[PDB]
Each structure stands twice: as structure tokens, then as C-alpha cells.
């Protein structure tokens, strides 16, 4: 369950937050495939309750009402078409699995659902699954309010209701079997793995129970007994009863310590210096690399009050954002996930964005298609960070240096740093307020390389900065602190 199952050589996945199935299918063929992306993490493909107040927030999709593959992203055959078309071009699909809960206990009764299924939250009624009141924990919780009141007690965070969400009784075989049925159908459709949403709120044992019921991957694209990729969402920044190391037995885990620590470093807050990133990795208190799923930001914390507060960098902070994403991508620690989001009107009142609920680009609830401009950027308010040359080329960079050891670290004692990945790639950063001028050993074979951050190798030419490494592997680097993108990168396949 630890292996990503991506096509050999592909080392990252992108979160196409709220994209429609028809757009992802196309995106797979027109771009993800050609650009070496390993796979896509899609938003919950199961039916959820419809929220009109606020008007269709993104989070309504974390309130399941059934497991019918029917949502604002698309129907089941659209979903199927997408999995077939992405796999056929070497791009895996990973489903966001919301299995710890159904919708909010205080929702109205009726069919106000993405697929018209009926449900009565008040009575724990979900005929379309079907689930009854005895399929929920209600009695098992011991807090007075029935909700989570203290994260210092593992029992209530796993047996009580997260923000009113009807907590599913995952200890019951009936429940585990029903969830496995949903995930297995997905597997049979072609899905390569899952993100286990809100793992923190479930017992590791119940997870295991469900996981062990899962089928092997679809032999149409994978070899025989291939196990699905499992990466559990556990927000562990320390200071709590629950720790991520408790779920290592089920698969990998989201290391939120990563994005928090890196954001601070790159932002140069609290006296942090990039030169301190020499021992980046487990050394910094992080979980074991082969258990980590890393990212700079996620759909949740990029909205601020998530895991990491304002230290988390996002596309709003473009310049610095690209440097962090680039450092993570060049560095060997963990398995990387890049974020691809959508724009919305932020409105911070007393330190909190009260518009952070706003859902994906839409025309009266109907999600907008993702339009591609000739310059390869996206339209209709989709940010498409996964298409910024700076990030796109670094995903290629990671693919190219795969398996190569961290090497040739250099730093100017302040905020200028650089390192290599064996003899296949080198990267330099200038995060100081002054010019960077140095002759560094790149570990790369002599030659002329295209800087993949300022340009691209097209035909027999570079569109941007050219770096010349002499026979002895050294090269002169010059980056003004005022450069558009204060870091250069070159690799085996960017060599002219």
C-alpha cells in the first residue's frame, strides 16, 4: 500500500481540486501525460448533500449521502471514461475517500442531494447505501455534546461527531463491508489508490479492516496482485494525543509538518534561513520518507486557517510559492503532490477569510469547463499551478533525477543555497536580498543546459537562461535577488 503505483519514472500527483470528469480526461491526454505527471487526486466522486447556504461551498462534497458515483464533477460513465482515458496515457487516478462520516446530523430531510437520493440526517436514514441509525456511533461517544471537545483524548476524536458530521460506526463489519464495496467498485473501474479523508478521526484498526477487504488493481493497466496506493489524511503537527506513526501500518500519511516548516523557512519568518535546510527530511522531525506524502499546501490550508496558519505558501504568493514547490520537487524526501486550485474573492475579517467557503467556478451551481489559452494558462478562474513552467518543469525534474542521491550541497551562510541529485540534476536558489554569484560543482556531465525555470528546451534551443558546465562539472551561476524567479535548475534531459 506504500507504492504509488504510478507509471515507472513518474514521481508526482496533482490535486485537480473540483475539476469535472470531462475536463480531467482531456487534461490527462493533452497535458498530464506528455508532461510526466504520475496521476491525479480527484475530489470525492460519491454523491453528497447539497448546501445552498452558503451557496454550493466546496466543502459540501465532504458530506456523503450515498456512494452513487454522481456529483457536480460528473456521472458514473463520465467518471469511468475519465479513468480509462487517463490510465491509457499513463496517468493514474486517486480518489478522495470520505468514509469516516456521512452528512451533517443537522441537515434537512429530503432529496437535496447531488443525485436526488433521499436521506434523513436527523434519523440517520440513508436508504441509497443503505445505512440505518445502528450504523453510526451515537452511543459510543461519551462527551456531553456528542461532539469532539478535546483532541487530547483519542476516543472522542474517533467516536464523536466532527463538526456535527454523523460519525460512521466503522467497527461494524456491515459498515466496513459497505465502504469496501464502494472503494472496490472504484478499484475495478481503474482507480490506482485513495486518499483516506479524515483518517485522524478513525481507528487505525478499522482502516486496516476496510483496506484488507480491497481487491487487487485492474490488470488491464496494472500487473496482477498490485495493491492500491494508500495515503491517509492525518493532520499531525504535534501537540496532540494522536500521532501519524499510528497509521504507518495502513499506508503512507500526509506530512503536514512539511508544508508548515518550509513555508516559514522560505518566507524567512522567525529568523529561519534556507541554509538551515541542509538536513531537510527526517532530521527535521518528519516521519520516515517512505511513509510520507508531501505537499507545500493543500485545498484546506491554502485557505489560511488550516494546518500551518499563514506560514503556508500558496499561489497567492506566486514568486515565493514557486521556490518552495521547486525545493520540494528537487529534494528526495517523500512522495510529492502538487496543488492545482481555483481563484476566489478573499475577505479577511478579524484574521479569517469569510469567503473561504466559496466553491469552484460556476454558472448557477454548474461547474465551469477548464479553458486553455494559447500561452498554456487556464481560463474561467482555474489557476492551474500545475501548468506554470516553473512547477511543470520541476515535476519533470523529479522524474529525471529519480533514485539519485542528495549531493553537492552549497550555501552562502544565509539564504543562498544549492544541491544536486547524483549526476542527473542540479538546482540553485537565491533567497537573500542581494546578488548571487558563484561557481558551483553541479555533479553534472560537461555541457550546455537549459534553465528549466526561466525557459524550456525546444528543438535544439533554450528559450531562457543557458548554463554552461565545464568538463569538471562546475558552472558559473548569477541570480539577481530581483530576478523574476530567483532560482535556476538543470537536468540530464534539459541538456542541449
Amino acid at each position, epitope marked *: 500500500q506504500y507504492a504509488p503505483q504510478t507509471q515507472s519514472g513518474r514521481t508526482s500527483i496533482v490535486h485537480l481540486f473540483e475539476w469535472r470528469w470531462v475536463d480531467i480526461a482531456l487534461e490527462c491526454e493533452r497535458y498530464l501525460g506528455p508532461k510526466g505527471f504520475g496521476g491525479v487526486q480527484v475530489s470525492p466522486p460519491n454523491e453528497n448533500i447539497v448546501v445552498t447556504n452558503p451557496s454550493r461551498p466546496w466543502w459540501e462534497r465532504y458530506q456523503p449521502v450515498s456512494y452513487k458515483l454522481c456529483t457536480r464533477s460528473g456521472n458514473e460513465n463520465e467518471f469511468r471514461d475519465m479513468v480509462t482515458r487517463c490510465n491509457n496515457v499513463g496517468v493514474r487516478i486517486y480518489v478522495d475517500a470520505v468514509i469516516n462520516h456521512m452528512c451533517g446530523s443537522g441537515a434537512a430531510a429530503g432529496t437535496g442531494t447531488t443525485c436526488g437520493s433521499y436521506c434523513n440526517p436527523g434519523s440517520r436514514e440513508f436508504p441509497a447505501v443503505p445505512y440505518s441509525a445502528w450504523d453510526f456511533n451515537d452511543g459510543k461517544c461519551k462527551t456531553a455534546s456528542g461532539g469532539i471537545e478535546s483532541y487530547n483524548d483519542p476516543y472522542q476524536v474517533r467516536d464523536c461527531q466532527l463538526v456535527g458530521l454523523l460519525d460512521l460506526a466503522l467497527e461494524k463489519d456491515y459498515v466496513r463491508s459497505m465502504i469496501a464495496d464502494y472503494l472496490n467498485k472504484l478499484i475495478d473501474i481503474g482507480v490506482a489508490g485513495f486518499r483516506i479523508d479524515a483518517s485522524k478521526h478513525m481507528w487505525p484498526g478499522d482502516i486496516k479492516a476496510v483496506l484488507d477487504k480491497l481487491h487487487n488493481l485492474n490488470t488491464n493497466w496494472f500487473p496482477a496482485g498490485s495493491r492500491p496506493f494508500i495515503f491517509q489524511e492525518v493532520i499531525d503537527l504535534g501537540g496532540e494525543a494522536i500521532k501519524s506513526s499510528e497509521y504507518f501500518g495502513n499506508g503512507r500519511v500526509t506530512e503536514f509538518k512539511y508544508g508548515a516548516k518550509l513555508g516559514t523557512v522560505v518566507r524567512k519568518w522567525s*529568523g529561519e534561513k534556507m541554509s538551515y535546510l541542509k538536513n531537510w527530511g527526517e532530521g527535521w522531525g518528519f516521519m520516515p520518507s517512505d511513509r510520507a506524502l508531501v505537499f507545500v499546501d493543500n485545498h484546506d490550508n491554502q485557505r489560511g486557517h488550516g494546518a500551518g496558519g499563514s506560514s503556508i505558501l500558496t499561489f497567492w504568493d506566486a514568486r515565493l510559492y514557486k521556490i518552495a514547490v521547486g525545493f520540494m520537487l528537487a529534494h528526495p524526501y517523500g512522495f510529492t503532490r502538487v496543488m492545482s486550485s481555483y481563484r476566489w474573492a478573499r475577505n479577511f475579517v478579524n484574521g479569517e477569510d469569510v469567503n473561504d467557503w466559496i466553491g469552484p467556478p460556476n454558472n448557477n451551481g454548474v461547474i465551469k469547463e477548464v479553458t486553455i489559452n494559447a500561452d498554456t494558462t487556464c481560463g474561467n478562474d482555474w489557476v492551474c499551478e500545475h501548468r506554470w513552467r516553473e512547477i511543470r518543469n520541476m515535476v519533470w525534474f523529479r522524474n529525471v533525477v529519480d533514485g539519485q542521491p542528495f549531493a553537492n550541497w552549497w550555501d552562502n551562510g544565509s539564504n543562498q543555497v544549492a544541491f544536486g541529485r547524483g549526476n542527473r540534476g542540479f538546482i540553485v536558489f537565491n533567497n537573500d536580498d542581494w546578488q548571487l554569484s558563484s561557481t558551483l560543482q553541479t555533479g553534472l556531465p560537461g555541457g550546455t543546459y537549459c534553465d528549466v525555470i526561466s525557459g524550456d528546451k525546444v528543438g535544439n534551443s533554450c528559450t531562457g537562461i543557458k548554463v554552461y558546465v565545464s568538463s569538471d562539472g562546475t558552472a558559473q551561476f548569477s541570480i539577481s535577488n530581483s530576478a523574476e524567479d530567483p532560482f535556476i535548475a538543470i537536468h540530464a534531459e534539459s541538456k542541449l
Partner: nanobody
Framework: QVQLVASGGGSVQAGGSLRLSCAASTFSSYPMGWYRQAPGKECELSARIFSDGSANYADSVKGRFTISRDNAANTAYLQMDSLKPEDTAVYYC?????????????????????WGQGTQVTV
């Protein structure tokens, strides 16, 4: 419940020395550091010691301060030699896995999760 109690501190003349101590009742297998907050100034990381023993040092203290741990008593240490009046500020002991924050004087310090009450140093 973890509690980080810092010791040492006080006033001293320029060029003098001070040794700060931090006790913890949390073990010591993750990074522990020392931050300092001067009046009206941003919070700054002074020195950090990683599990393996390697350390980070603010360029302005490098060669003048020496961070260390004991393990045999769960105590971290920060020896401050050749003190300078610029070193005047409140020093906070900081430790733990993951990350946390310290909200002081309207400013927040992103760091190690657990902080100490802060000891006053004056040069």
C-alpha cells in the same frame, strides 16, 4: 502535559557570559532551539540542535554561542560568550515535534510547538 522551564538569564556587562538552561517534563529526540525577542523587533531563531546533534546558528551569534543537550537529564543548554548589547532580549526555550507558534506583543513566532516562559537577558 509538557512544561519547558528555562533558567539562567539576567544582566551582564559587554563581553561577559551567560548560560541558559531548559528543563522539560517531553523527552529529547527531536530538535530543540532557542529564540529571542527584542523589544519592538521580530522574533528571531538564535540556535537549534537536531536529534543527531547538528545545529543551526544565527550568523550574528555563530562562534559566540554554543547550544547543547544532555539527554541524561533532559536539559538543553545555550552558552553565550562575548555577549553584546545587541544580544539584549527575552530568550524563549522552544521544543517538540511538528510546529507551533508563540504570540507575544501582537507578533507570532512560528517554531517547535512548545515554548518556555522566556528569560530576560540584558547586556
Amino acid at each position: 502535559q509538557v512544561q519547558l522551564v528555562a533558567s539562567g538569564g539576567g544582566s551582564v556587562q559587554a563581553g561577559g557570559s551567560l548560560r541558559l538552561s531548559c528543563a522539560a517534563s517531553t523527552f529529547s529526540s527531536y530538535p530543540m532551539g532557542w529564540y529571542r525577542q527584542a523589544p519592538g523587533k521580530e522574533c528571531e531563531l538564535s540556535a537549534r540542535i537536531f536529534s543527531d546533534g547538528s545545529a543551526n546558528y544565527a550568523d550574528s551569534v555563530k562562534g559566540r554561542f554554543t547550544i547543547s543537550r544532555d539527554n541524561a537529564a533532559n536539559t538543553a543548554y545555550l552558552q553565550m560568550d562575548s555577549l553584546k548589547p545587541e544580544d539584549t532580549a527575552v530568550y524563549y526555550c522552544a521544543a517538540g515535534p511538528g510546529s507551533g507558534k508563540l504570540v507575544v506583543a501582537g507578533r507570532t513566532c512560528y517554531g517547535p510547538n512548545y515554548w518556555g516562559q522566556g528569560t530576560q537577558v540584558t547586556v
